[PDB]
């Protein structure tokens, strides 16, 4: 189990760690989060009490370094940093652990929620979507736009998700216009799976990462990307059977975890009704269709 210490908490803030959330008062004796499960990526995120504008946070994997949080009064935010002196770090964490200055990652033993939301998400792929190579962790916030959004303005601070566009030369083979537009299997299996992503694990990883940025930061371009990647599968007549089964599990846990009160802005009515009721895969998402109909029957 690993630890992310905090130098201090000078400003009142809600801190979230994956699907968990807690409140830290201004100048409260808070010095970080312990017992974080090894083996998964994690996200630590922030919403200031004084300006709920800008949710922001950091994707990281404790196997890749020793990371801590330190408020910066000039830039006005909690910053993740790496500590290279391993002895300095282990001593610091131990002293704080000895003084009970940290909140415990509260993982119920039965609970596989985080694994099920991050199964295919890898730090190395996150770092290609979020480009900042001098750090081992990746900053995301509510306002960051995607490469495709910039095509429709600072490229260094963009989310470089894979561009999906159903009315594009990449998506449509000359002479198969009607075929490829109505059945997207060519675009899914040859262009995206075989050509760009290489395998379905990497595709699912980007899909899961896009969902999590939409949920935790309200990132609109991420929501667009999540729905586009769903729709490309549902709109393909020919999809490997193992991908459909896994997609159903992925989406089930995403819909299960979504806050009930954010459904109106995080769920696209058109995509979900098409995918569940009109698409080629309308009958292949039994778990997802059941939880959607019992939790958000209004949307449908």
């Amino acid at each position: 189990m690993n630890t992310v210490p905090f130098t201090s908490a000078p400003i009142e803030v809600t801190i979230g760690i994956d699907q968990y959330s807690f409140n830290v008062k201004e100048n409260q004796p808070f010095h970080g989060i312990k017992d974080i499960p090894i083996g998964h990526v994690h996200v630590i995120h922030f919403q200031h009490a004084d300006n709920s504008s800008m949710r922001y946070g950091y994707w990281f994997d404790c196997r890749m370094g020793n990371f801590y949080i330190q408020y910066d009064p000039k830039d006005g935010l909690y910053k993740m940093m790496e500590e290279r002196d391993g002895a300095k770090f282990e001593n610091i964490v131990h002293n704080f652990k000895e003084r009970q200055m940290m909140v415990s990652y509260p993982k119920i033993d039965e609970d596989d929620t985080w694994y099920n939301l991050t199964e295919f998400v890898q730090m190395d792929k996150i770092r290609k979507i979020v480009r900042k190579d001098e750090n081992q962790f990746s900053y995301v916030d509510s306002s960051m736009t995607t490469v495709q959004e910039n095509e429709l303005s600072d490229p260094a601070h963009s989310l470089n998700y894979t561009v999906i566009n159903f009315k594009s030369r990449e998506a449509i083979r000359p002479g198969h216009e009607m075929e490829d537009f109505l059945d997207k299997s060519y675009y899914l299996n040859t262009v995206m799976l075989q050509g760009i992503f290489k395998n379905s694990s990497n595709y699912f990883g980007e899909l899961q990462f896009a969902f999590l940025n939409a949920m935790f930061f309200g990132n609109y371009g991420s929501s667009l990307q999540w729905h586009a990647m769903i729709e490309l599968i549902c709109s393909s007549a020919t999809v490997p059977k193992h991908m459909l089964d896994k997609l159903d599990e992925i989406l089930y846990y995403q819909i299960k975890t979504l806050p009930e009160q954010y459904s109106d802005i995080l769920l696209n009515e058109r995509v979900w009704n098409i995918c569940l009721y009109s698409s080629f895969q309308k009958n292949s998402l039994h778990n997802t269709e059941k939880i959607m109909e019992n939790k958000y029957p209004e949307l449908l």
Binding site: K167, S168, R169, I172, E177, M178, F181
Partner: protein, 237 residues
């Protein structure tokens, strides 16, 4: 964006544009089978592609053989339309290619956009006007060439005959739409109006009769009467 009453003079400016109407591409007769079920029999169709400024009508005849062995024909027809319009554009010199294509039905937007991806600078636009181009098959010479075709064929006509020698393209399009609206509301009455006087003929190279300016004003008045009438005979007013 969508073409409507507010931006109507744009049709007669000097940017090349085409209207595309697909309402006569897939045409059927519905009939009973020996077993008492219902079946369709396709008949020849046409794409109506029109330059409203010049009157040029690229009439692509759709022969029934194009539907043989195909499913979901009403959907295929929109894509066949888009395929043929794209082929037409590619066949034209660059300086004759349109800068906008206006479709008369919104269901043509995605088929045409996808077929025209090679031409990102050509705008594909819908319209809020309820244009009467379905009635093109009430023009006898156009119906004749469509029905006689034994293979796919493109015929080129000017739908304004020689009107542009005497009137503007705004006025010519207004006359065309009035004639076609009349033919759509009551084909027989409209056709009686146009031919009742045997001394006014249709030139071999024309679609409509050779009315003098004064006769066109009478004719046009008679078509407006018909349209208001039938609007009474219809709604009882």
């Amino acid at each position: 964006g969508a073409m409507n009453s507010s931006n109507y003079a744009e049709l007669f400016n000097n940017d090349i544009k085409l209207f595309v109407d697909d309402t006569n591409v897939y045409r059927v007769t519905v009939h009973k089978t020996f077993e008492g079920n219902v079946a369709t029999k396709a008949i020849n169709g046409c794409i109506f592609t029109l330059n409203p400024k010049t009157g040029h009508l690229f009439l692509k005849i759709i022969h029934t053989s194009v539907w043989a062995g195909q499913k979901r024909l009403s959907q295929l027809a929109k894509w066949k339309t888009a395929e043929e319009v794209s082929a037409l554009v590619r066949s034209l010199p660059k300086e004759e290619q349109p800068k906008q294509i206006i479709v008369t039905r919104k269901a043509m937007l995605d088929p045409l956009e996808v077929h025209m991806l090679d031409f990102p600078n050509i705008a594909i636009r819908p319209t809020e006007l309820r244009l009467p181009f379905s009635a093109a098959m009430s023009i006898d010479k156009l119906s004749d060439v469509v029905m006689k075709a034994t293979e796919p064929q493109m015929v080129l006509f000017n739908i304004y005959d020689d009107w542009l020698d005497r009137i503007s393209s705004y006025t010519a399009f207004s006359r065309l739409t009035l004639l076609l609206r009349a033919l759509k509301t009551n084909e027989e009455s409209a056709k009686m109006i146009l031919l009742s006087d045997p001394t006014i003929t249709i030139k071999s190279y024309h679609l409509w009769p050779s009315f003098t300016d004064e006769q066109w004003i009478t004719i046009e008045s008679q078509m407006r009467d018909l349209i208001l009438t039938e609007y009474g005979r219809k709604y009882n007013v």
